[PDB]
Short mmCIF file of C-alpha atoms in Angstrom, two decimals:
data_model
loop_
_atom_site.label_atom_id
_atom_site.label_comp_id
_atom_site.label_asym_id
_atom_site.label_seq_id
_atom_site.Cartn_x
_atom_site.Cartn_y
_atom_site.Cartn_z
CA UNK A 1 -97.68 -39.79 -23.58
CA UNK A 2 -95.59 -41.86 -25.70
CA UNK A 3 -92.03 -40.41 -25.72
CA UNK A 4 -92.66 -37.55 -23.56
CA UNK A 5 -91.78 -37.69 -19.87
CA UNK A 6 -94.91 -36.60 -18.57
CA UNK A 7 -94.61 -34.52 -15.22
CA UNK A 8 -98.10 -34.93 -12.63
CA UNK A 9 -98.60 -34.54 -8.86
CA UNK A 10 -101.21 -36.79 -6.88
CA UNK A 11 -103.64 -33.49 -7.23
CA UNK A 12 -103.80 -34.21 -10.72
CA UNK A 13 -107.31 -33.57 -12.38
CA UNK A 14 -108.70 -36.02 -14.40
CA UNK A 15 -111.47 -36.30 -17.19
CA UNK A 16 -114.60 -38.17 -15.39
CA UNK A 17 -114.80 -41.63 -15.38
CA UNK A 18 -111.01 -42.14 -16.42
CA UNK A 19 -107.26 -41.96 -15.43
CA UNK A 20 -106.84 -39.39 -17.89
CA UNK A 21 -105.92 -35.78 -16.94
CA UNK A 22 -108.32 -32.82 -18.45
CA UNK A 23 -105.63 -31.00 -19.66
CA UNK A 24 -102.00 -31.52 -21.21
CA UNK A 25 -99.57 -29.08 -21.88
CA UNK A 26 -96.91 -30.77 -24.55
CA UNK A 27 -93.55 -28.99 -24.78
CA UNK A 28 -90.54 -29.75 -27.63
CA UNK A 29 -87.76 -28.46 -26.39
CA UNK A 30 -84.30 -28.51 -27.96
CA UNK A 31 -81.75 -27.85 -25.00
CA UNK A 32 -79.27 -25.85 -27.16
CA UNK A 33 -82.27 -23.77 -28.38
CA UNK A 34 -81.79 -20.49 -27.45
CA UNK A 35 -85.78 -19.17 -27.49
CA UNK A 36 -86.30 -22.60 -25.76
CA UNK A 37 -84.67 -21.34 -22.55
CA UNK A 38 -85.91 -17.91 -22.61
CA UNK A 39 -89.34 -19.72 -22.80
CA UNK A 40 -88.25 -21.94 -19.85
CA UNK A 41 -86.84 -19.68 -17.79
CA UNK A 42 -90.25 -17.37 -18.65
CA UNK A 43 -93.02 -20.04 -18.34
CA UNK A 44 -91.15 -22.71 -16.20
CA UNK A 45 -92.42 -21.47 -12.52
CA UNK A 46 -96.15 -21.19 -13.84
CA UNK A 47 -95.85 -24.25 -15.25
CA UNK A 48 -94.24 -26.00 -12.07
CA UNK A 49 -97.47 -24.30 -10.18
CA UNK A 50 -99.88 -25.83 -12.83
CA UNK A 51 -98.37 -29.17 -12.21
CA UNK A 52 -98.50 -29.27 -8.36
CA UNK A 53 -101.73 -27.96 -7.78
CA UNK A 54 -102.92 -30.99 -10.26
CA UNK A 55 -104.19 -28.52 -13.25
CA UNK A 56 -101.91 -30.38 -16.17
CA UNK A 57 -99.97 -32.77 -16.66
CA UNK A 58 -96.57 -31.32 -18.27
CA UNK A 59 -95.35 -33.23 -21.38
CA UNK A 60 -91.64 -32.58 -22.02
CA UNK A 61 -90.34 -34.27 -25.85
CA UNK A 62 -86.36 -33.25 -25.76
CA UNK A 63 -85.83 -33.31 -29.53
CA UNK A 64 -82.03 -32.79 -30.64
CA UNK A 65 -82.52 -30.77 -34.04
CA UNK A 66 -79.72 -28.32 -33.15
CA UNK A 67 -76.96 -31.38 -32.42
CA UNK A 68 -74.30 -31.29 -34.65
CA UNK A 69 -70.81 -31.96 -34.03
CA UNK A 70 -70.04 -28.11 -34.30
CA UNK A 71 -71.59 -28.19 -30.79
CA UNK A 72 -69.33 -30.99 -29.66
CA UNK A 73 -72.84 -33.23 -30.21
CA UNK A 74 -74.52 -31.28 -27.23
CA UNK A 75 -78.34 -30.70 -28.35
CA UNK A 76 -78.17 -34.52 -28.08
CA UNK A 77 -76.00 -35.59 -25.18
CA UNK A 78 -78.34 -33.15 -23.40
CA UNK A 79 -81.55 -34.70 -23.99
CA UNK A 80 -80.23 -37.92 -24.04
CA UNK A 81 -79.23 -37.28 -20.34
CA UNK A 82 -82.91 -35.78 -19.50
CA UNK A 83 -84.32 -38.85 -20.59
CA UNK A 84 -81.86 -40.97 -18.12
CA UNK A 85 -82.69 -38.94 -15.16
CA UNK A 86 -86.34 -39.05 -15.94
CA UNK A 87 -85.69 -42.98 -15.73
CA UNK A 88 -84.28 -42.60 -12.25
CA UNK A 89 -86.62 -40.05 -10.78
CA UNK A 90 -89.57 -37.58 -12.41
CA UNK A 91 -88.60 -34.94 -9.54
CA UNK A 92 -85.10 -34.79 -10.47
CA UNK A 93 -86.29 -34.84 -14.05
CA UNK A 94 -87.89 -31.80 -13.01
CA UNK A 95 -84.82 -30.06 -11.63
CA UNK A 96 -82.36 -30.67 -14.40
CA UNK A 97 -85.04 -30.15 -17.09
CA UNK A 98 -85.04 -26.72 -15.78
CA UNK A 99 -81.35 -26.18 -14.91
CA UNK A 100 -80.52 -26.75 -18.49
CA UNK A 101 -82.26 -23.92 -19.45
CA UNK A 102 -81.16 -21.52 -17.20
CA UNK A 103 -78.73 -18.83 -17.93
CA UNK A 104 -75.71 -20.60 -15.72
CA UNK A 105 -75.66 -23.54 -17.78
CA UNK A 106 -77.26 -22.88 -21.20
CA UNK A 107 -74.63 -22.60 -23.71
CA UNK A 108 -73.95 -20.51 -26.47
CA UNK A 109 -75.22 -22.30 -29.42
CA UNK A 110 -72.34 -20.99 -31.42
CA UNK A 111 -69.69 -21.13 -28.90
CA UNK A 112 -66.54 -23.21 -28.48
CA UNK A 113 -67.17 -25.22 -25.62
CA UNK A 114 -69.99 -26.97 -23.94
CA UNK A 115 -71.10 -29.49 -21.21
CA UNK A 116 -69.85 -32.51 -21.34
CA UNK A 117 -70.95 -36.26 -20.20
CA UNK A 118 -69.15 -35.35 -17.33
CA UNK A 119 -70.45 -32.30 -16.43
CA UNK A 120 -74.30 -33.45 -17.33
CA UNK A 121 -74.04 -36.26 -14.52
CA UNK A 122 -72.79 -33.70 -11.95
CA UNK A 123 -75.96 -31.67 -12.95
CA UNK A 124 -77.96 -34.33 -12.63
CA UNK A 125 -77.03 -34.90 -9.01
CA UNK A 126 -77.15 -31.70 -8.50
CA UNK A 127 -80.82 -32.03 -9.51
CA UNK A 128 -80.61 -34.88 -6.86
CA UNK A 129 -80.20 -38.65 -9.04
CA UNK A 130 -76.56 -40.34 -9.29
CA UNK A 131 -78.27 -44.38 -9.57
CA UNK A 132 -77.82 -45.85 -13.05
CA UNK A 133 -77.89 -41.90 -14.32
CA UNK A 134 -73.59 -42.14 -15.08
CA UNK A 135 -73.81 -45.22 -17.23
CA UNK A 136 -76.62 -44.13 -18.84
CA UNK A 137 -75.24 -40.74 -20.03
CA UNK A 138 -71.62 -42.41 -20.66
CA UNK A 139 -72.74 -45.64 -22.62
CA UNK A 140 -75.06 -42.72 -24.95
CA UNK A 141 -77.96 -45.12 -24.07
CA UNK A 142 -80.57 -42.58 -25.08
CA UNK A 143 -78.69 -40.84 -28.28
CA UNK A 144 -80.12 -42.75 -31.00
CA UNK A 145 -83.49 -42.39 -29.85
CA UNK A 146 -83.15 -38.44 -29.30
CA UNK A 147 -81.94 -38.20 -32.54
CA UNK A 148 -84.61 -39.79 -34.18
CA UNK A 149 -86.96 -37.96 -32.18
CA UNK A 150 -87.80 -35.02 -34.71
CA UNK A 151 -88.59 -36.90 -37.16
CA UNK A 152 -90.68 -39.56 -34.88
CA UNK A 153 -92.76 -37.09 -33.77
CA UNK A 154 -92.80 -34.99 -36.70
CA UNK A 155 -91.99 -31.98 -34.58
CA UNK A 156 -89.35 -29.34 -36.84
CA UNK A 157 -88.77 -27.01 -35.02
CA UNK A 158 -88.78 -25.60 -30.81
CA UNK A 159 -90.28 -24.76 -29.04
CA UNK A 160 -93.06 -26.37 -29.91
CA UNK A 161 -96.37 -25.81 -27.46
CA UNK A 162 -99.41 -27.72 -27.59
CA UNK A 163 -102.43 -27.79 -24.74
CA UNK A 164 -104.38 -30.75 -25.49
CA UNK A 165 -103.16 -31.43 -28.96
CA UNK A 166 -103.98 -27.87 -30.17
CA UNK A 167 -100.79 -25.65 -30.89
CA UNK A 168 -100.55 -22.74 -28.96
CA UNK A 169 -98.67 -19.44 -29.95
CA UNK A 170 -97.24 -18.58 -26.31
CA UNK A 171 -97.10 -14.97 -25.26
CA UNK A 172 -97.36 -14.76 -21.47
CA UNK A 173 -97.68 -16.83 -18.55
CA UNK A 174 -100.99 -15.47 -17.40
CA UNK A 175 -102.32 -15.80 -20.63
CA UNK A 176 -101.29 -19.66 -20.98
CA UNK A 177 -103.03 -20.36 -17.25
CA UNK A 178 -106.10 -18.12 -18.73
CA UNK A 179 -106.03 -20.84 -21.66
CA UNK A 180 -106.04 -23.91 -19.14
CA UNK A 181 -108.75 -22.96 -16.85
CA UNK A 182 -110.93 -22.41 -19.54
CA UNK A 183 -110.32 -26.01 -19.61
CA UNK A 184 -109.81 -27.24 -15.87
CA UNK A 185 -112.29 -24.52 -14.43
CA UNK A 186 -111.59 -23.64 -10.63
CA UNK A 187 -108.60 -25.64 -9.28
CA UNK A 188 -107.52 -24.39 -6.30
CA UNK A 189 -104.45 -22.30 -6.24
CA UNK A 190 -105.11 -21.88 -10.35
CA UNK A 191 -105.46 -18.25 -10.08
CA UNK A 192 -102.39 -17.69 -8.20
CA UNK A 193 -100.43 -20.06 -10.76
CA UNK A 194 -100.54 -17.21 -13.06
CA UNK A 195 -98.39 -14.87 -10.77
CA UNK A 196 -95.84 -17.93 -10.14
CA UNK A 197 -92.34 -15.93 -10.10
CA UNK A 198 -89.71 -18.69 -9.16
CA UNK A 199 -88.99 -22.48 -9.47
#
C-alpha cells in the first residue's frame, strides 16, 4: 500500500490465487480537516465493521496540507504521530486514528491552541501504545515525510476516497457498503456492516 497504513483482520478476503485483498478502501485524511472528521466520525464504525468481518482492507494516507505554523504545526505533528503508533501496533493505530477525529479532541482549525507532542503521546496510550511511540513523536521522526506526503502522492485535497483505485464521491454509509459488495459479494456480517452505529 505504499505509504498508507493499511488496516486488515485475519478474515480478510482475497482475490483468488493471491495475497491480495478484493477490495481496498483508500482514505486521505488531513487531521485538522474539519469535513475529514465529520466523515470519520460518520463512516468510521462501518468502516471498522468492513475491516473485521475481512470485506476491505482500510488504507489510511495522513497527508498534512492544512499544517502551518498558524496551527502551532498541528496537521503535521498529528499525522506524524499516526504514523509512529501505526509502527508500534495497527490496533492502536486504529484507536487513535479515530480519536483524532472525534469531537473531544479535534481542534478548531482556526483556533488558538492545539495538541501538543505531549498531549498526542498521552492519546496514543490512551489508544493503548507507549513503546518507542514518545521518541518518535518528540524527535519529529515522521514530519518530513508527512509533509511531503501531498505532493508524493499527488493527493490536494481531503478527504480523499478511493475503493480500488476508483474515486468515490461519499454520501452515506450504506451506500459505500452497497458499493463494496458489489465487489466482495456475500461476506458474512456485510449486510449488517451497513447499520454499524459505534466504534
Amino acid at each position: 500500500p505504499g505509504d498508507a497504513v493499511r488496516v486488515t483482520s485475519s478474515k480478510l478476503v482475497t482475490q483468488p490465487g493471491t495475497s491480495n485483498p478484493k477490495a481496498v478502501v483508500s482514505f486521505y485524511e488531513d487531521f485538522l480537516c474539519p469535513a475529514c472528521g465529520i466523515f470519520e466520525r460518520g463512516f468510521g464504525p462501518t468502516v471498522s465493521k468492513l475491516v473485521d468481518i475481512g470485506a476491505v482492507a482500510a488504507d489510511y494516507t495522513m497527508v498534512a496540507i492544512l499544517d502551518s505554523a498558524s496551527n502551532q504545526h498541528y496537521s503535521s505533528r498529528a499525522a506524524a504521530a499516526a504514523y509512529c503508533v501505526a509502527d508500534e501496533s495497527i490496533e492502536a493505530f486504529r484507536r487513535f486514528h479515530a480519536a483524532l477525529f472525534s469531537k473531544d479532541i479535534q481542534p478548531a482549525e482556526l483556533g488558538k491552541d492545539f495538541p501538543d507532542n505531549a498531549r498526542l503521546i498521552e492519546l496514543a496510550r490512551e489508544a493503548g501504545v507507549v513503546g518507542k511511540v514518545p521518541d518518535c513523536i518528540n524527535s519529529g521522526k515522521y514530519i518530513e515525510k508527512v509533509d511531503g506526503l501531498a505532493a508524493a502522492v499527488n493527493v490536494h485535497a481531503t478527504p480523499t476516497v478511493r475503493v480500488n483505485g476508483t474515486e468515490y464521491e461519499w454520501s452515506t454509509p450504506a451506500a459505500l457498503v452497497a458499493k463494496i459488495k458489489e465487489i466482495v459479494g456475500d461476506v458474512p456480517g456485510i449486510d449488517s456492516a451497513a447499520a454499524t452505529a459505534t466504534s
